Amino acid sequence: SVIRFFDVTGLSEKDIERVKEEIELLKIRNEYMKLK
Amino acid sequence: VIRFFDVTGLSEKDIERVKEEIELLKIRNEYMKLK
Amino acid sequence: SVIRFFDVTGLSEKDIERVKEEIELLKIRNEYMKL
Amino acid sequence: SVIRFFDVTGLSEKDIERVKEEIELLKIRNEYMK
Ligand SMILES: [Cl-]
């Protein structure tokens, strides 16, 4: 897989989860685009 | 403070969106700190 | 189709574009649930 | 103030809340730059 470091200085754990959910939204889109 | 995230398959523009979301959250917190 | 209004006061066209993109991602997630 | 209309077909209530939060983050950024 591929893992990247991000600077999340000052972000709360609730903020982190919002960032994680944004990553998942993008991955879900790519899982649809890859079908064709 | 540095976290790693799995970004498998994310394009270059996808990574940009993630970086911008992070920035938006930092600014909200600096804007809370300039209360 | 379902159309809703949002207060977007002070948002630039580029901020609006970011909102539209977020809506698009949310719709895709609902499609993906159907598989 | 300014409102705009968006097609949100299929979005759940919680989905709509995520959109509203993104708007508010964008508004806060502008309130900070000013
Ligand atoms: Cl991860």
Author numbering:
A (entry chain D): 124 to 159
B (entry chain A): 125 to 159
C (entry chain C): 124 to 158
D (entry chain B): 124 to 157
Task: Quote the paper.
This transcriptional regulator, named Rco, forms tetramers in solution and represses the main conjugation promoter Pc that controls the transcription of genes 28–74.
Crystallization trials on apo full-length (FL) RcopLS20 were not successful, but cocrystallization of FL RcopLS20 with various DNA sequences did result in the formation of crystals. The asymmetric unit contains four monomers forming one crystallographically independent tetramer. Each monomer consists of an elongated sequence comprising residues Val125–Thr132, which includes a four-amino-acid β-strand formed by residues Arg127–Asp130.
